[PDB]
Amino acid sequence: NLPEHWTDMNHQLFCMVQLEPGQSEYNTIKDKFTRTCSSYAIEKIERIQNAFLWQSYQVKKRQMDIKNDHKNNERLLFHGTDADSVPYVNQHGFNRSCAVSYGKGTYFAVDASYSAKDTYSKPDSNGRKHMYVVRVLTGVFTKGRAGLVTPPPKNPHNPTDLFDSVTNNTRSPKLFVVFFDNQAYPEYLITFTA
Amino acid sequence: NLPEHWTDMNHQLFCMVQLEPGQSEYNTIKDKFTRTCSSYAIEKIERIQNAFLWQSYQVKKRQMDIKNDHKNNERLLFHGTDADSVPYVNQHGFNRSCAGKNAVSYGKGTYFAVDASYSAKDTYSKPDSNGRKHMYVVRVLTGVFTKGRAGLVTPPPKNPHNPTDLFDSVTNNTRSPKLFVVFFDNQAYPEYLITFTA
Numbered sequence: 547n548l549p550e551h552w553t554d555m556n557h558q559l560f561c562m563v564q565l566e567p568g569q570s571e572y573n574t575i576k577d578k579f580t581r582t583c584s585s586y587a588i589e590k591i592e593r594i595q596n597a598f599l600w601q602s603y604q605v606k607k608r609q610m611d612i613k614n615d616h617k618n619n620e621r622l623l624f625h626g627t628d629a630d631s632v633p634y635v636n637q638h639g640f641n642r643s644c645a646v647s648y649g650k651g652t653y654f655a656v657d658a659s660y661s662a663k664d665t666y667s668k669p670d671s672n673g674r675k676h677m678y679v680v681r682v683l684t685g686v687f688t689k690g691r692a693g694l695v696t697p698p699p700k701n702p703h704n705p706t707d708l709f710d711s712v713t714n715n716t717r718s719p720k721l722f723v724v725f726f727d728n729q730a731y732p733e734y735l736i737t738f739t740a
Numbered sequence: 741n742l743p744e745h746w747t748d749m750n751h752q753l754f755c756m757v758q759l760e761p762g763q764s765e766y767n768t769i770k771d772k773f774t775r776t777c778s779s780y781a782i783e784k785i786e787r788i789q790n791a792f793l794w795q796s797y798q799v800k801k802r803q804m805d806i807k808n809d810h811k812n813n814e815r816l817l818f819h820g821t822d823a824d825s826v827p828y829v830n831q832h833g834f835n836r837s838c839a840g841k842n843a844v845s846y847g848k849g850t851y852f853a854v855d856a857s858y859s860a861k862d863t864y865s866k867p868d869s870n871g872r873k874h875m876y877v878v879r880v881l882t883g884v885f886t887k888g889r890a891g892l893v894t895p896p897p898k899n900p901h902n903p904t905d906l907f908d909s910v911t912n913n914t915r916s917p918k919l920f921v922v923f924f925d926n927q928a929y930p931e932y933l934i935t936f937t938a
């Protein structure tokens with residue numbers, strides 16, 4: 547069940563599709579980035595069409611929608627990374643086994659400006675920086691802490707019934723951490739400069 | 741997609757089903773265990789019916805079967821663990837982030853044994869305060885594998901010039917495999933829990 551806005555892949559399962567500037571889709575993604583990164587220069591935006599990652603993600607979304615007995619389990623977040631990690635993320639998504647103050651998971655920012663820090667979106671030998679726009683199954687979350695390897699339980703009376711993710715601040719989150727494969731789908735890759 | 745042999749779970753997502761000795765399902769697992777663990781005695785064998793783990797596992801299996809083309813991608817292996825880990829494994833499966841360092845490390849992942857004797861070591865299936873030891877029988881997507889290395893946090897590439905095209909798992913010895921390491925969630929489905937004693 548590949549999404550309607552994807553483009554044909556000639557019977558293949560993985561493609562990076564460069565977006566046409568000025569079209570509805572490109573405009574939407576660029577605006578999410580310029581809300582906090584208007585001082586940067588966008589070189590291109592690519593749609594990630596990874597059928598396998600999408601299928602595993604959508605299975606997890608359907609399960610989380612059942613478990614939590616509502617939708618509203620998904621957020622669009624940012625992830626800055628180095629050039630050498632981009633091929634892996636495009637093909638395999640996010641891997642917690644690759645500062646982790648809120649737990650040993652994959653970190654996602656609410657604001658592109660956070661992911662735009664050189665510590666995350668490391669400029670490559672050519673000055674290029676890389677940031678993903680990511681569908682993240684944040685679900686029901688709680689405050690994180692150092693050394694978590696999974697989210698805490700929602701009630702220590704049932705230690706296996708877990709929060710879906712953790713954050714820095716439940717009332718006004720700025721970051722989320724997820725601790726499982728296929729809780730995050732890398733949807734767009736922004737290539738940009740300072 | 742739930743298997744038709746499973747008990748009806750009345751819209752519940754999870755159940756453990758105690759098997760009966762003399763059924764082929766029980767006997768095949770007891771024989772697989774006793775081939776290398778005849779000095780131990782089985783208390784019970786439970787079928788793990790975990791709808792969400794099954795769904796995610798079967799998605800990964802279909803993907804590996806597509807990608808590899810006509811490989812036997814799935815092996816039935818053993819995993820010994822401590823009693824404190826059993827509720828988590830039953831509900832959530834095998835988390836590499838929780839895995840112990842193996843005495844012979846072929847990577848930083850979850851380990852699965854070919855022989856029940858390996859998993860039956862107290863270092864894995866730690867006896868609980870009542871002398872009960874716990875071993876899972878696990879469907880593992882071993883796929884295409886190579887000899888592992890202690891530094892791995894994912895399987896190595898098949899080709900160093902294409903670093904994202906990975907082996908599916910690693911092993912101690914490709915000609916005589918006795919352990920497999922997997923590095924991804926939902927690559928192993930806990931199918932049976934064997935409770936056993938000396």
Ligand SMILES: NC(=O)c1ccc(OCc2cccc(Br)c2)cc1
Nearest residue numbers: 624625626647653654655661666721
């Ligand atoms: N890779 C990313 O885009 C990214 C990396 C890290 C991150 O948050 C890390 C963090 C940890 C503790 C305190 C703060 Br404020 C931020 C948020 C996002």
